[PDB]
Amino acid sequence: LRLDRLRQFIGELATLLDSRPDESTLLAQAHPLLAELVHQDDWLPEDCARPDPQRYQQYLLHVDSRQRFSVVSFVWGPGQITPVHDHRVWGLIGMLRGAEYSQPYAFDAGGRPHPSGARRRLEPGEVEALSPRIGDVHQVSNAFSDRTSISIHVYGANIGAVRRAVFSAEGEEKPFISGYSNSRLPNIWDLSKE
C-alpha cells in the first residue's frame, strides 16, 4: 500500500489550511490535492474498503488535531443509496473506484425538497465540492447495482460527530449523526513497515 500518498495529502491539506484561506479558496486549492490522491487506487487499506450487505460503510481514515478536517472512506455495496441529507460543513468528495450518482436538492418555502439541478455521475479520479454556502443538500447512490463503489471524503470537521439531518420527500426533518463503521483507525504512520 502507498500510504505515503495518503500521508502526503493529509500534510498538504493541513498546510493549505494553515494559510487560513476562505472556504472558496480552500475548496478550489484542495480540489487538486484530493484528485491526485484518488487518481490512483493503490493506497486504501482493505479493511477500509469492505462493503456491508445492509448499509454502506463509513471508515474514518484520519482526523486533524484541531478537527479542521476529517478523511473518510465511503463504501457502497451494490445498489446502496443515502436518503436526502445535509452536511453543515465544507466537503470534497473524490471518487476512488466504481461510480456514484449525486443529485443536489433545494427546499421550497414550505419545507419540501426538490432536485435543484442535473444529477451528476462521478467517475474515478473526479472530485466534487459541497458546503452550506454553495449547496449542502443532496442524495447519493452507487451508480452500479452489480459492484462495490468507493469514494474518499474530506469534511471540514469530525463529520461522524456533526449533528445534521435527513429529509423526507414531504420535507420532514430528522436529526442525524452518522458515526463511523470502524472502532479502530488504520495505522498509516509506521514507516518501518514499508
Q: Which residue ranges are tagged as binding site for Fe cation?
A: 85, 87, 138
Give the annotated binding-site residues: 85, 87, 138
CA distances from 13 to 80, 131, 155, 159 (A): 30, 17, 11, 16
Pairwise CA distance, residues 137 & 154, whole Å = 16
Pairwise CA distance, residues 36 & 30, whole Å = 10
- The DSSP call for residue 46 is G
Pairwise CA distance, residues 68 & 79, whole Å = 32
Quote the cell numbers at residue 12: 498538504
Pairwise CA distance, residues 160 & 134, whole Å = 21
Which residues are paired to 122 by β-bridges? 100
